[PDB]
Amino acid sequence: GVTSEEELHLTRKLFWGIFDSLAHKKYDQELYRMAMPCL
């Protein structure tokens, strides 16, 4: 996720690697795969 609202550049990597965001359909019903932690 990270910076979802920063570089407003239309030709940025955001509009380029937008398909990389969809690349997460591998996980099935792993909505309850783990708890909730960060840094």
Q: Sketch the per residue contact string, 1 through 39, with other proteins: x for CB under 8 A, - otherwise.
A: x--xxxxx-----xx--x--xx-xx---xxxxxx-xxxx
> What are the C-alpha distances in Å from 9 to residues 2, 15, 17, 19, 22?
16, 9, 13, 17, 20
Q: Which two tokens stand for residue 17?
A: 């690697």
We find the least distance from the C-beta atom of residue 22 to other proteins, in angstroms, to be 4
C-alpha to C-alpha distance for 33 and 29, rounded to whole angstroms: 8
Considering CB under 8 A, how many residues would be counted as binding other proteins?
23
Give the residues lining the site for other proteins (CB under 8 A). Answer: 1, 4-8, 14-15, 18, 21-22, 24-25, 29-34, 36-39
